[PDB]
Amino acid sequence: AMIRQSVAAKTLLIENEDGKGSTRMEVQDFMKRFHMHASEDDKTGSPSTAWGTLRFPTKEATAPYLRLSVNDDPEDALLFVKAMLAQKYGETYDRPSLILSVTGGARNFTLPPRLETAIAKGLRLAAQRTNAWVVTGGTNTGVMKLTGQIMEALSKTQSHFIPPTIGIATYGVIIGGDDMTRGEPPKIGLEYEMHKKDPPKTTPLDDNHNLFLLVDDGSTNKFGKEIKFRAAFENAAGQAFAAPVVTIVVQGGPGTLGTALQAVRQGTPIVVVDGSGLAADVLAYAYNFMHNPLTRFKSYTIDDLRQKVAQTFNPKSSQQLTNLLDSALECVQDPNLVVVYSLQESGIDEFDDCILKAIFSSQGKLGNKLKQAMYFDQLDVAKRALSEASKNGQHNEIAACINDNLMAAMMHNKPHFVELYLGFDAKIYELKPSEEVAKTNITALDELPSFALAIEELYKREAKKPHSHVQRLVSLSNTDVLGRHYRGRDLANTRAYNVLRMDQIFARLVSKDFSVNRDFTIYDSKYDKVPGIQFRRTAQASHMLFLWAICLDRFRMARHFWLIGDQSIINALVASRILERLSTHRALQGPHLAEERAKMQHNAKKFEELAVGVLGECHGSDSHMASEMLHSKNDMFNKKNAINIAYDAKSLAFLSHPATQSVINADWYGHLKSVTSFWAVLFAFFFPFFVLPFINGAHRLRRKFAKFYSAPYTRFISDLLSHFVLCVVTSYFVLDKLEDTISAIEWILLVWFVALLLEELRQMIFCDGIAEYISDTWNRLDLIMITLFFVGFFTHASDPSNQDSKVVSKGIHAFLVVVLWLRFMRYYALSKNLGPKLIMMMEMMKDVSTFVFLLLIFLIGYGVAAQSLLSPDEDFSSRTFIGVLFRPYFQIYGELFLDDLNSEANCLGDTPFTECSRETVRMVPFFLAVYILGSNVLLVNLLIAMFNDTYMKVQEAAEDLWRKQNYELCAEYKDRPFLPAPFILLAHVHMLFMRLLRLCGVHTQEHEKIQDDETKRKITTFEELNTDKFLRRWERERQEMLEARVKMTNDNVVQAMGMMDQLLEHMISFRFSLDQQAEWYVPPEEYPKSGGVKRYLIDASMVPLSIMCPSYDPVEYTHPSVAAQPVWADPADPRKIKFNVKDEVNGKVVDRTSCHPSGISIDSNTGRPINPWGRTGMTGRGLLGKWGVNQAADTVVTRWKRSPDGSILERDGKKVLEFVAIQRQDNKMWAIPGGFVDNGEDVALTSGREFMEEALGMGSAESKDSLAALFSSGTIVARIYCEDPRNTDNAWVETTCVNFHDESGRHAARLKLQGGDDAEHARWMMVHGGLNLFASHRTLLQHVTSALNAYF
Ligand SMILES: CC(C)CCC[C@@H](C)[C@H]1CC[C@H]2[C@@H]3CC=C4C[C@@H](O)CC[C@]4(C)[C@H]3CC[C@]12C
Ligand SMILES: CC(C)CCC[C@@H](C)[C@H]1CC[C@H]2[C@@H]3CC=C4C[C@@H](O)CC[C@]4(C)[C@H]3CC[C@]12C
Ligand SMILES: CC(C)CCC[C@@H](C)[C@H]1CC[C@H]2[C@@H]3CC=C4C[C@@H](O)CC[C@]4(C)[C@H]3CC[C@]12C
Ligand SMILES: CC(C)CCC[C@@H](C)[C@H]1CC[C@H]2[C@@H]3CC=C4C[C@@H](O)CC[C@]4(C)[C@H]3CC[C@]12C
Ligand SMILES: [Mg+2]
Ligand SMILES: [Mg+2]
């Protein structure tokens, strides 16, 4: 399967530069911006005709390829990739939150299975969770092939969106480039032949990569010519999708080291996979040596690294090895930007956590790190970051980013993060939308708060996804912008997912008269001082999101918002109804939605269970308080109590519960005592003054009197008694003879049936709809009993003295009495014994109909046959038909008319069917014998069997249906007037008088009673406490099941085996461990800052002043900066100046004495000083400002390198130092801070001033006191000669070194290092012997570490 057709694309959606939407443009128009080079000689190039899709063997999908020039814009390539994704997966494609650049070895290599599996699993998890763009080299060898193999399982095991695998490769090495170039673009499904013999090129593309950018420069069979574009694309993609770029380094050669060096220099973090060998092992060794505080790394040395580098890369020259070592040490200088993953240290499936660790150390703002922590589903990491931010005084940034972080957590359906963000003092009703809503002319829309617009954004964002049920539900709803059912356009579409309209849609989903009441006026700032307002604001906000979470069927988030708010049961019933109706709605039908549909139905059942469970818990704890809770009217749903809600939600399970039934029975009896049976209420009803006071003052006796007759049970009793007299009086009237005029009893019955007709009309028009009224069968029976009487009365009243009219009137009134007595069975439904039995009967009527259809066959067959057999010579008449129907129907009830049959057959014998006139009539008994065998033996007994089966089947459902009808009857007799049927006319004239006085007169109103806030908060507190108690009991109960215990035992064993696997791994490591347990300086030729002026070159064996060297001819060159004569520069003529002693220039002493034992010798010919430290191939002062000894002061502010835990880092058994070093502006090499000693100052002042100027720049309070305390203890450790490249034979640098050591490290930690003046960057760097530092500063720190017994 899965091969239908292939059709070429003609138009593409290219995203605009604003980043807001995609515009449709022609493929050749968009694709014009890419160029190709026909040859190496060519520079301008020609427009690219090489783009399309490549089809690779054993791969179902095709991978797009585009050949683009080196001069092409990386933004255009990014647009091409974006356009492809937009074309394939629609406009709303999953944007990448991570760019994973995979670098390493070009040649093939084998990794250990555990490490490869861990790396593959972690990379697959990271890529699938963040929708990451993986950028590799694209060739079918090494780390690119490994990455392709890793991403292949992700492309196979997952449906819909597949994360792109972009391969950026040099076109000049790719097999099949000529085939790809030739043709008319685009080449749809072009076959790629990796085994085809391309002569010059030998590198094929990897078949598992999803896209391909072939960078062309016209060269052939040269590698490495795309690296800069690749870096530029990754940076461009990173800026466009606001995503960090994370490089992953697996194995690798020397160019991978240079690539990694470039990556950290550009701020991009790297993840080094330790244990993969080669350059990765070198990088891992270097970091672990420089940063890791564990005990097993304390034996790490540079000598062993150098040995490792020499044994691994095998350089041709020593300088290459030194440069490689220097580059490797330069990569791991910043500990945050390199994260090393190792199999023997880190755990299995923790590779995505490392990637996340690199991400945290990469992005500086708090919000981006939390968003990324959400994507990888690492709550603990987010919790630790939040706790650390809370402890370190970063509380303001937390509040600034929580809203967006909380919003992001809700869109991606992560409640656990929702709980985290909400726990750190983030108010739920303070959400803010990402975009700004435009102003609307409607006042209802303008009244809406900020959070409402945030939900509107969640609805819009979820709705824009393909084949979303939300869009179909809103479109099918056929409502306007405010949700009213009325069915300009721009306003109706841009804010089509506002919360009011959604509230209206959910209201119609519940029932026909459900209307949720919102009050957004409480969110204004003027009501903040009112007590308890927060809870209300919380509860309302929670409710609105709760409804949103019900719509998207996110059960866990729904349960969380349901728990946060109040009115738990009603909300669970409403939720159950909305899901259940939504699960069978027209908007959710479709082939792809099946699992979704199933999930909603499941969730509906769960919510129903919750509503029952919480109710049960309440009734278990306090029955009276549970009754008070069920009777409470809630303002949000039009003052409807929980039972009204339950009936509207059609929750049979809730209504059949004993707590609910107790409340309904209490409502029936009207909360009075000593009123349970029929006889008690009947006795109290007939004798009001003798039983009521003695049951449990004027306002007591009067209250009890007003309470008893307002009870619905009392109105039933009045209605029964009224209907019973009606039956008795009408029965007497039909039995007694009619008089010659209209009698008095007839007039009484006329008045009584008009009163019943007026009540039926009042119920029909002024109490319910006509459809609702006719639906009920008892209302239909009522209409028949009224029509039959009036037909009967008018038949008699038309001619009262006519005998025939009286006879016809009694004939109609016979049915009237039959219906009346049948209607009297309506009042049996209130009884717990008679009521279900009545519903079962109505169920058994179908079986009665089945029996009637089967008997009808035998009755008409036997009847026609028997009647014909008895009378074979009679003309057909009506009597023949009566003979067919009469006897056969009664013979089934045991009345057999055998004597009558014998008389009709004209058989004169003593034996019944002997000596007859015709022999055929003797067959009359035989037919009947068969007939009564068919009817009484077979059919009646079959009916008994069917009724037995039917009862057992529908008894429980009938009982539940009776419990719903109990409320229905209670609700019906609550609003019905007290006065019975003949007197109801008085009640009717009273209601008409009240309606006339209210509508026209307007002299009155309605009064009611509202429950106090104390009792309201008591009900709220009780309901919340029992909700929590039920959830605790429910969780413990589901954990004590057998299936759960077996599953928990299984997971516990596996995890025990995992720990055992780790234990053996450590043993195998121990087995291995136990098994193995048994100097003249010559300056450079070109003088610095001289504009290319070169010295006179000399060999290193001619450096000593003791050696003669007669061919020494130095060049006299002086720099323009020194020749311009600044304040700190000595005069150009060095005559009359005294050396080897402290000399005064402008009355200030300068250090003109050198520490060299021979001293400075003065040339007699020119007066210039002669350098005692050797020849430099240059006379004159050069770039140095002072003749002879230029006194410099260097400041080495040092501290012990400590881990966070507080332990001192220890290498080679000695403690390791760390000093502030600045990177020089002129030659971009790191160096010790320092400068020339100023006039009138000592090394103490010079050292302090230089340290403040370079490392600190502009500099307080406590930090100034710490710096002064640190600067109060300085020791002059050395006064040596500098090996500075600006030194000449007449001007040389001599340094005094001042060391400021921070033993505790408290004072050093307050310094904000930032490069200024003649320094580019300043940082704390560790002192060691492998440092590639400026001049002879390695000797100076060596002296510092020698003096302070520190590592070197
Ligand atoms: C829905 C049910 C209740 C309908 C009942 C219809 C009743 C009221 C009507 C329908 C047909 C009527 C019968 C039609 C004709 C006659 C013949 C006349 O010489 C005497 C009355 C008699 C016998 C009528 C009695 C009343 C009657 C049975
Ligand atoms: C398989 C079933 C339907 C077979 C039915 C057989 C019927 C058609 C036959 C079988 C025997 C027949 C009867 C045999 C003899 C007599 C006596 C004669 O003076 C009158 C007719 C009468 C009484 C016959 C009536 C028709 C009869 C009942
Ligand atoms: C229908 C199948 C199952 C059985 C058929 C049996 C019928 C054909 C038999 C059973 C008993 C029989 C009757 C028994 C006796 C007599 C008396 C004789 O002087 C005339 C025929 C007459 C009246 C028979 C007519 C046929 C009869 C009705
Ligand atoms: C166990 C049950 C099924 C026993 C069956 C009894 C049958 C065989 C008996 C019961 C009544 C009998 C009938 C009674 C009377 C007459 C009238 C006579 O002039 C001819 C035989 C005839 C028509 C009989 C035929 C056989 C009969 C139908
Ligand atoms: Mg709650
Ligand atoms: Mg009625």
TrEMBL record:
Q: Which residues bind Mg(2+) 2?
A: 563, 565, 1024
Q: Any idea which positions bind Mg(2+) 11?
A: 1254, 1318
| Keyword Calcium in annotation | yes
Where is this chain primarily localised? membrane
Q: Where does Mg(2+) 4 bind?
A: 760, 782
Quote the record's binding site residues for Mg(2+) 6: 1234, 1254
Instruction: Report residues binding Ca(2+) 4.
Output: 779, 782
Q: Which residues of the sequence carry a binding annotation for AMP?
A: 1128, 1185, 1190
Q: Name one GO cellular component term.
A: plasma membrane
Q: Which residues bind Mg(2+) 1?
A: 562-563, 565
Q: Which domain of life is it from?
A: Eukaryota
Residues binding Ca(2+) 1 are 563, 565
The UniProt similarity line reads: Belongs to the transient receptor (TC 1.A.4) family. LTrpC subfamily. TRPM2 sub-subfamily.
Q: What is this protein called?
A: Nudt9 protein
Q: What is the lineage of its organism?
A: Eukaryota, Choanoflagellata, Craspedida, Salpingoecidae, Salpingoeca
